[PDB]
Design an enzyme around this catalytic site. Structure first.
Site, PDB file in Angstrom:
ATOM      1  N   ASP A  96      29.144 -75.939   5.943  1.00 16.40           N
ATOM      2  CA  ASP A  96      29.546 -74.518   5.884  1.00 16.40           C
ATOM      3  C   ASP A  96      28.348 -73.735   5.361  1.00 16.40           C
ATOM      4  OD1 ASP A  96      32.981 -74.821   4.543  1.00 16.40           O
ATOM      5  OD2 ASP A  96      32.178 -75.210   6.543  1.00 16.40           O
ATOM      6  N   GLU A 137      44.242 -70.943   5.259  1.00 16.19           N
ATOM      7  CA  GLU A 137      44.025 -70.583   6.654  1.00 16.19           C
ATOM      8  C   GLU A 137      45.369 -70.475   7.362  1.00 16.19           C
ATOM      9  OE1 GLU A 137      39.660 -72.877   6.867  1.00 16.19           O
ATOM     10  OE2 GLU A 137      41.600 -73.917   7.057  1.00 16.19           O
ATOM     11  N   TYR A 163      39.974 -79.379  12.480  1.00 16.85           N
ATOM     12  CA  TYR A 163      40.319 -78.020  12.892  1.00 16.85           C
ATOM     13  C   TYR A 163      40.626 -78.037  14.378  1.00 16.85           C
ATOM     14  CZ  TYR A 163      38.968 -75.567   8.550  1.00 16.85           C
ATOM     15  OH  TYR A 163      38.885 -75.110   7.248  1.00 16.85           O
TER      16      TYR A 163
HETATM   17  C1  LIG Z   1      31.296 -72.079   2.055  1.00 14.71           C
HETATM   18  O1  LIG Z   1      31.349 -70.829   2.636  1.00 14.71           O
HETATM   19  C2  LIG Z   1      32.481 -70.470   3.344  1.00 14.71           C
HETATM   20  C3  LIG Z   1      32.596 -69.202   3.889  1.00 14.71           C
HETATM   21  C4  LIG Z   1      33.727 -68.823   4.605  1.00 14.71           C
HETATM   22  C5  LIG Z   1      34.756 -69.729   4.788  1.00 14.71           C
HETATM   23  C6  LIG Z   1      34.651 -71.003   4.240  1.00 14.71           C
HETATM   24  C7  LIG Z   1      35.732 -72.023   4.414  1.00 14.71           C
HETATM   25  N1  LIG Z   1      35.373 -73.203   5.151  1.00 14.71           N
HETATM   26  C8  LIG Z   1      36.259 -74.293   4.851  1.00 14.71           C
HETATM   27  C9  LIG Z   1      36.173 -75.457   5.790  1.00 14.71           C
HETATM   28  S1  LIG Z   1      36.597 -77.084   5.242  1.00 14.71           S
HETATM   29  O2  LIG Z   1      35.707 -77.471   4.133  1.00 14.71           O
HETATM   30  O3  LIG Z   1      38.007 -77.166   4.829  1.00 14.71           O
HETATM   31  O4  LIG Z   1      36.337 -78.026   6.346  1.00 14.71           O
HETATM   32  C10 LIG Z   1      33.516 -71.374   3.525  1.00 14.71           C
END
Ligand SMILES: COc1cccc(CNCCS(=O)(=O)O)c1
Length: 658
Positions: free
Chosen positions: A232, A503, A615
């Site tokens: 991310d 989400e 996802y």
């Molecule tokens: C780390 O910066 C981010 C900015 C916007 C959204 C997110 C969320 N991503 C989560 C994905 S997972 O770790 O659950 O696969 C993270």
């Protein structure tokens, strides 16, 4: 060029098949190719498909094997104790098990190339590893090889790593076939790729798929094109889109919906070893998490995504600051200049950079693309490129100038280091996208922006209302537009969670009635309901019958257009597992008109319970089939980072699900 050995229809039932007499005397020279078509819908935990070994006493570590795990991982070992060589190359999440209830024929090609000293593995048309060594070990040059075995490895006269599965065809060649020749080997894939390594995005990695069926029948997909491995933000990530005009059979070359130019778009093989895999592009601006909706009235397609300035992600984003200043009930984007300690500038109407200490304006303006102009002249910055040439990640100037953007590290004026939401629109159903525009803050001057829920926004069927779900601490924050996305307002819906990655995706059960399904921290998917087209929201309930991990996974959801068993139907896509992101399912729910309760009646397993599924994106195709674009791997696991071509697309019919 002909095989030196060809055999087929072998059933591996926890009993090895000896092919020594057929194969061993045929092996010659130091280069070999193995081509194998195999099924394994009930694999053992760790099993060998093919083995060449010294089966004698004292030489148990002198063998070549092709092995797989019940995780979907594939690999080889090439071992010779006399030579002091123990090679192991592998990649997680490389296989299919079942599709529509039937065992999948995987096509594996392994190339052992003595000239290039390289070992390369393809599965289902996808290169899963390519490794060069200083000291090459030809697979039949292992000291004392005396056994060729299918479905085990013969070590010291015993069957190790017994397999359950079948080898429908296996061929061997005394040559390292070219990448070109490999491409001509017929495949029996249950999936297709929309976005893939080496395409127009030049990202080697992809995450966060979306799908949406447009009124014209065109099916649109968006995705995170992720350059710095699968991390991310902070990273470099652009948002790319592709569409299909033939019900998902073929897909257009991707274009960008949102992109930054501060770092080069580079196709990079991101290190997977424990020492380096957490290497992260640390100085690039990025986008992350996209969502799509179509507006019936204007006909426009609208795409939102989160935006991150250079070096910024959710972990280091300035909470307590929206990045805007409130002056008269209007919000203005704040800016900090080179050498100031605070943000003493704002971007006002028409893009004029104002100084706030003296309320005096400047000779600087911000254009539509958030680029800096001085006296109407475009300022530039030098672009960065990344490499691991030194043995660690390096980010350095590459000699190319690009427009100076306020989200960039090298910019004269910088935005607040926090997360924002951007919107773009397309007037031609995804053939081109406008320059993005920042949405205003919705929760106040001193609240950081909410996080976009990736997937689809919702276009209500009986009005012009458009909704995009977002989340923040303690609530879902729905963004609502009634004027084709020109203006937005929020509708807050509290949830009993602090700091959840909540989400959320929505379905319209009937006119004006929205059910939102969302990720939590409880191990269950939650939901809430609105009966006034999103104005007010119910308390939170939870789905029983589906399991998620403690950390959770995004869930996708659609209202199916046709009745099933005489009832209104909703389809959910999610992993079904309390252990990891695996056991992907589509779950068909029938609505009870008495009370709008849902009876989750059918569960369709996308692939094995043990195979990765994270996802996902689902859409009802114009022909009433179901399209599913999904991360086919565990995108949480620290062992499955930086895999290429694991976001894949399949086509299903409702009768497959029931
Ligand atoms: C780390 O910066 C981010 C900015 C916007 C959204 C997110 C969320 N991503 C989560 C994905 S997972 O770790 O659950 O696969 C993270």
């Amino acid at each position: 060029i002909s095989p030196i050995f060809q055999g087929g229809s072998y059933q591996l039932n926890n009993k090895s098949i000896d092919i020594s007499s057929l194969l061993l005397d045929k092996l010659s020279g130091e280069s070999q190719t193995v081509v194998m078509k195999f099924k394994a819908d009930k694999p053992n935990s760790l099993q060998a498909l093919f083995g060449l070994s010294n089966s004698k006493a004292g030489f148990k570590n002198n063998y070549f094997s092709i092995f797989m795990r019940d995780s979907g991982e594939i690999g080889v070992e090439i071992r010779d104790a006399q030579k002091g060589i123990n090679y192991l190359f592998s990649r997680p999440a490389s296989l299919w098990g079942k599709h529509k209830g039937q065992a999948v024929e995987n096509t594996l090609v392994f190339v052992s190339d003595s000239k290039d000293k390289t070992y390369t593995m393809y599965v289902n048309g996808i290169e899963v590893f390519s490794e060069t060594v200083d000291t090459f070990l030809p697979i039949s040059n292992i000291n004392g090889i005396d056994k060729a075995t299918l479905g085990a490895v013969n070590r010291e006269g015993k069957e190790h790593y017994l397999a359950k599965g079948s080898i429908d065809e296996i061929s061997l060649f005394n040559k390292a076939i070219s990448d070109q020749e490999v491409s001509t080997i017929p495949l029996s894939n249950p999936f297709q790729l929309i976005f893939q390594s080496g395409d127009s995005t030049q990202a080697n990695y992809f995450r966060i798929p979306t799908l949406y069926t447009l009124s014209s029948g065109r099916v649109l997909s968006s995705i995170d094109a992720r350059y710095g491995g699968t991390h991310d933000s902070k990273s470099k990530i652009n948002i790319a889109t592709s569409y299909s005009d033939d019900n998902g059979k073929t897909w257009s070359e991707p274009i960008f919906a949102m992109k930054f130019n501060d770092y080069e778009e580079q196709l990079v093989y991101w290190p997977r070893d424990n020492k380096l895999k957490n290497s992260q592009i640390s100085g690039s601006a990025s986008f992350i998490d996209s969502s799509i909706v179509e507006d019936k009235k204007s006909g426009k397609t609208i795409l939102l995504a989160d935006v991150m300035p250079a070096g910024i992600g959710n972990n280091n984003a300035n909470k307590a600051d929206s990045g805007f200043k409130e002056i008269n009930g209007h919000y203005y984007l704040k800016l900090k200049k080179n050498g100031d300690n605070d943000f003493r500038y704002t971007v006002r109407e028409n893009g004029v950079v104002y100084n706030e200490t003296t309320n005096k304006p400047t000779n600087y303006t911000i254009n539509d693309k958030y680029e800096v102009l001085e006296g109407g002249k475009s300022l530039t910055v030098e672009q960065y490129s990344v490499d691991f040439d030194s043995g660690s990640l390096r980010e350095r100037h590459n000699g190319k100038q690009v427009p100076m953007n306020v989200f960039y590290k090298d910019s004269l004026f910088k935005v607040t280091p926090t997360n924002y939401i951007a919107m773009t629109t397309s007037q031609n159903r995804g053939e081109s996208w406008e320059q993005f525009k920042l949405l205003p803050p919705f929760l106040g001057e001193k609240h950081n922006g909410t996080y976009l829920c990736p997937g689809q926004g919702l276009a209500l069927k009986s009005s012009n209302r458009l909704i995009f779900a977002t989340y923040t601490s303690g609530e879902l924050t729905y963004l609502i537009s009634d004027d084709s996305g020109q203006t937005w307002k929020k509708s807050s819906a509290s949830i009993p969670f602090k700091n959840a990655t909540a989400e959320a995706q929505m379905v319209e059960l009937r006119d004006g009635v929205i059910r939102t399904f969302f990720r939590t921290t409880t191990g269950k998917i939650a939901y809430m309901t609105s009966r006034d087209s999103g104005e007010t929201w119910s308390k939170v309930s939870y789905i029983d019958g589906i399991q998620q991990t403690s950390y959770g996974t995004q869930v996708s959801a659609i209202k199916y257009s046709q009745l099933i068993d005489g009832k209104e139907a909703v389809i959910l896509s999610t992993p079904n597992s309390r252990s990891g992101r695996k056991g992907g399912q589509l779950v068909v729910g029938l609505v009870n008109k008495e009370d709008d309760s849902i009876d989750w009646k059918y569960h369709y397993d996308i692939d094995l319970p043990s195979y990765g599924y994270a996802y996902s994106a689902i859409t009802e195709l114009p022909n009433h089939h179901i399209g599913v674009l999904f991360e086919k791997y565990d995108s949480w696991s620290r062992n499955e980072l930086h895999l290429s071509n694991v976001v894949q697309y399949i086509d299903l019919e409702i009768n497959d699900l029931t």
